[PDB]
Paper text:
Transporters of the Nramp (Natural resistance-associated macrophage protein) family import divalent transition metal ions into cells of most organisms. In addition to the physiological substrates Fe2+ and Mn2+, Nramps can also transport toxic metals like Cd2+ and Hg2+ but exclude the abundant alkaline earth metals like Mg2+ and Ca2+. Recent bacterial Nramp structures reveal a LeuT fold, three stable conformations (outward-open, occluded, and inward-open), and identify the metal-binding site residues, including conserved aspartate, asparagine, and methionine residues. We present high-resolution structures of DraNramp in three conformations in both Mn2+-bound and metal-free states, providing the first molecular map of the entire Mn2+ transport cycle.
We obtained a structure of wildtype (WT) DraNramp in an occluded state bound to Mn2+ at 2.38 Å by soaking crystals with Mn2+ (WT•Mn2+). We resolved a comparable structure using co-crystallization with Mn2+ and the inward-locking mutation A47W. The similarity of both structures, including a nearly identical Mn2+-coordination sphere, suggests that the observations we make based on these two structures are robust. Although the inner vestibule is occluded in both structures, WT•Mn2+ and A47W•Mn2+ differ in their TM1a position, with WT•Mn2+ nearly identical to G45R whereas the A47W•Mn2+ TM1a is displaced within the inner vestibule, likely to accommodate the bulky tryptophan sidechain. ITC with Mn2+ agrees with the structural data, with two-site fit for A47W, and one-site fit for A47W-D296A, A47W-D369A, and G223W (assigned to the orthosteric site). (C–D) Double mutants of A47W with either D296A (C) or D369A (D) retain Mn2+ binding but not Cd2+ binding, indicating that Cd2+ binds only at the external site and not the orthosteric site of the A47W construct, whereas Mn2+ binds at both binding sites.
Author numbering: 45 to 436
Write the structure that this text describes.
């Protein structure tokens, strides 16, 4: 199973930005958002995985083959904007880590990131599998560090428990809450996960399809459960480190290493930036591969990979030339990603409730309703954010 490197999206630089900023600025009051977004992601990623197993096709393929041509065109275009926002936080997050490790300007950090992403693009599994394992080592261990630091930091349990009750903290809190949902419920994974499980069967029977669904549901929840524990711990450690005090540039990724200083000591700066670098490079490489697959499913053709790697790279250089804050752009991209979630959910909820698509593996009616409740929740939360951002 070499497809495990796609699991870095739940630990991409977007999660680092939203977790650290959420704790530093709003303390523990956003823990419930991470728990909600992680539970929503378990349901959605199971439906996506069950769609590929039951139907044998990925979600963009089904839209292309079943829905009218103009609707398929609109769905491919909005899927490309999702890939732009997704790759932006991951590519810029890698460039930021280059600056944290070498002091190199953000422009040259992106130049280095570009050459590296172009090099990984045309590599086979022989030279990539050791890199995938090395990335998984840094990110897992930096996640274990937060799981250990969240206990050693002695957090205020009264504020931690209160943080699991849904509450907003002004206008900027809904903005960051929407960003936390997009950082966990990622639209590009909704399309991609259906493609990772398609064509993965051996005897093409119902009993075998039910077997792959059972194994997937246990594997998804086990990994998603660990990712949620890490994300909550990272926000809790960030809250216990910065919130309530007045630390300069609190929440920014250039100072986030201080969250692990009591545990790692003088090594907290390098190990954080190394984990952020491996996270950004692998997610940006997987994201480029995923966008090529999503376009092929929607349109029947695709642009060459070097051209896609080039187009998705321009906004990162534009943002750097604009002098914008990298951590603030990482959050904004996650916010934009959450506005693409309802578009991905509607065909997922419809297709997995169809017998001519799923066969005997039609989704249970209870989980179809929970999915539509999740979709309505995210549509309502995206609308309230757009309401305050436009005024009133
Ligand atoms: C991140 C969330 C994004 C939310 C906003 C979504 C993207 C907005 C722009 C859409 C392009 C216009 C959509 C229409 C697609 C082209 C016009 C069309 O209808 O297709 C042409 C023809 O009918 C088929 O062959
Ligand atoms: C769980 C679905 C995530 C996406 C697919 C990754 C599969 C990971 C499963 C086992 C990892 C051990 C290596 C096999
Ligand atoms: C523990 C946080 C996740 C819970 C499950 C995700 C659902 C998201 C919204 C729940 C509001 C439930 C209403 C409870 C009262 C909220 C306002 C007081
Ligand atoms: C087992 C390996 C252990 C390696 C542990 C160290 C890792 C250093 C990270 C990148 C190398 C580039 C660092 C050189 C860049 C010079 C600019 C700079 O980082 O300045 C900071 C300091 O004042 C002067 O290094
Ligand atoms: C993990 C990868 C870390 C980096 C290792 C690959 C080195 C980057 C290659 C060319 C640099 C492009 C030009 C260098 C930037 C200008 C420096 C002045
Ligand atoms: C394709 C691989 C990249 C090729 C590089 C391989 C190694 C050369 C390293 C440094 C020199 C790079 C050129 C440095 C010249 C910069 C002059 C300048 O004006 O800097 C402005 C800055 O680029 C904002 O526009
Ligand atoms: C403190 C709990 C409230 C925080 C709310 C955020 C959610 C965090 C989720 C799981 C905690 C991680 C626990 C992982 C256990 C590893 C830590 C540990 O074992 O602590 C050893 C230490 O030496 C003993 O003194
Ligand atoms: C089961 C999975 C294990 C994973 C580990 C998850 C860590 C969660 C630990 C603490 C969260 C909330 C505990 C706080 C209990 C309620 C808050 C409190 O301390 O009481 C204050 C009172 O409610 C106000 O007046
Ligand atoms: C799923 C991903 C796997 C990780 C599991 C998440 C860890 C904790 C889950 C339950 C939250 C426990 C805390 C809730 C009990 C305290 C509470 O209810 O908060 C009210 C507060 O005490 C009034 O002020
Ligand atoms: C091999 C296994 C371990 C490999 C990773 C260990 C950490 C590496 C370097 C620590 C940081 C580099 C040394 C920093 C010295 C700079 C200094 O003197 O202080 C900086 C100060 O914080 C600024 O104001
Ligand atoms: C803004 C819209 C995107 C801009 C449009 C592209 C801009 C040109 C960029 C690089 C040169 C093309 C990449 C060079 C690789 C050529 C690939 C190719 O055709 O292969 C021929 C030959 O084998 C090669 O070695
Ligand atoms: C077919 C045509 C393509 C369809 C296009 C659909 C529109 C793009 C959708 C979401 C992007 C939202 C981006 C919001 C930009 C906010 C920028 C910002 O807030 O930053 C301040 C500004 O950059 C000062 O530097
Ligand atoms: C709210 C934002 C998300 C809205 C999803 C956009 C597609 C909605 C309906 C078309 C799907 C039904 C088409 C089925 C046969 C034609
Ligand atoms: C706050 C809202 C979130 C609530 C969180 C509740 C926890 C549910 C999470 C995972 C269970 C599995 C989800 C759906 C798994 C597939 C269900 C199904 O019907 O699949 C049967 C068929 O065999 C295959 O196609
Ligand atoms: C609000 C929940 C409304 C959605 C309820 C879905 C009912 C269902 O069972 O889905 C099959 C139906 O034909 C839809 O495709
Ligand atoms: C948390 C979600 C609460 C679980 C409640 C199940 C959601 C539901 O309503 O499913 C029942 C439906 O009426 C049967 O078709
Ligand atoms: C600002 C706060 C705004 C608060 C409201 C925001 C959500 C409103 C409408 C969502 C409609 C989404 C679709 C829900 C319709 C239920 C459904 O599932 O109908 C499809 C049918 O089941 C297939 O056959
Ligand atoms: C910016 C692209 C807009 C579409 C993005 C989908 C998210 C839902 C958006 C508004 C909810 C409208 C209904 C609630 C009032
Ligand atoms: C009443 C249900 C039928 C609505 C029809 C949907 C139309 C517009 C959305 C109106 C949203 C309804 C209530 C707004 C709740 C909300 O999410 O927004 C909060 C508001 O912007 C500040 O408090
Ligand atoms: Cl708090
Ligand atoms: Mn993510
Ligand atoms: Mn900054």
């Amino acid at each position: 199973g070499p497809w495990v490197i796609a699991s870095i999206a739940y630990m991409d630089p977007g999660n680092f930005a939203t977790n650290i900023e959420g704790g530093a600025r709003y303390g523990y009051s956003l823990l419930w958002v991470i728990l909600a977004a992680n539970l929503m992601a378990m349901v959605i990623q199971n439906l996506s995985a069950n769609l590929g197993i039951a139907s044998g096709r990925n979600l963009p393929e089904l839209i292309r083959e079943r829905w009218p041509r103009p609707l398929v065109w609109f769905y491919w275009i909005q899927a490309e904007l999702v890939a732009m926002a997704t790759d932006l936080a991951e590519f810029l997050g890698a460039a930021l880590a280059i600056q944290l490790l070498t002091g190199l300007p953000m422009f040259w950090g992106a130049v280095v990131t570009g050459v590296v992403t172009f090099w990984l693009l045309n590599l086979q599994k022989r030279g990539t599998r050791p890199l995938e394992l090395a990335v998984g080592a840094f990110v897992l261990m930096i996640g274990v560090a937060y799981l250990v630091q969240v206990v050693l930091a002695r957090p205020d349990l009264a504020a931690v428990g209160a943080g699991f009750v849904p509450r907003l903290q002004g206008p900027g809190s809904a903005y960051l809450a929407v960003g936390i949902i997009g950082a966990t419920v990622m639209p590009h994974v909704i399309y991609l996960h259906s493609a990772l499980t398609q064509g993965r069967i051996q005897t093409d029977t119902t009993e075998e399809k039910r077997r792959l669904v059972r194994l997937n549901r246990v594997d998804v929840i086990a990994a998603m459960g660990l990712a949620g524990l890490i994300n909550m711990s990272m926000l809790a450690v960030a809250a216990a480190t910065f919130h309530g005090k007045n630390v300069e540039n609190a929440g920014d990724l250039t100072t986030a290493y201080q969250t692990l200083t009591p545990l790692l000591g003088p090594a907290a700066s390098v190990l954080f930036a190394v984990a952020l670098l491996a996270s950004g490079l692998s997610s940006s490489a997987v994201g480029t591969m995923a966008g090529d697959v999503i376009m092929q499913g929607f349109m029947g053709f695709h642009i060459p990979l070097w051209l896609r790697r080039l187009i998705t790279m321009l906004p990162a250089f534009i943002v750097i030339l604009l002098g914008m804050d990298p951590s603030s752009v990482l959050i904004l991209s996650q916010v934009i990603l959450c506005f693409g979630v309802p578009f991905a959910l509607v065909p997922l909820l419809l297709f997995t409730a169809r017998r001519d698509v799923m066969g005997a593996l039609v989704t249970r009616r209870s989980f179809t309703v929970i999915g539509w409740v999740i979709a309505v929740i995210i549509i309502a939360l995206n609308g309230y954010l757009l309401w305050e951002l436009l005024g009133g």
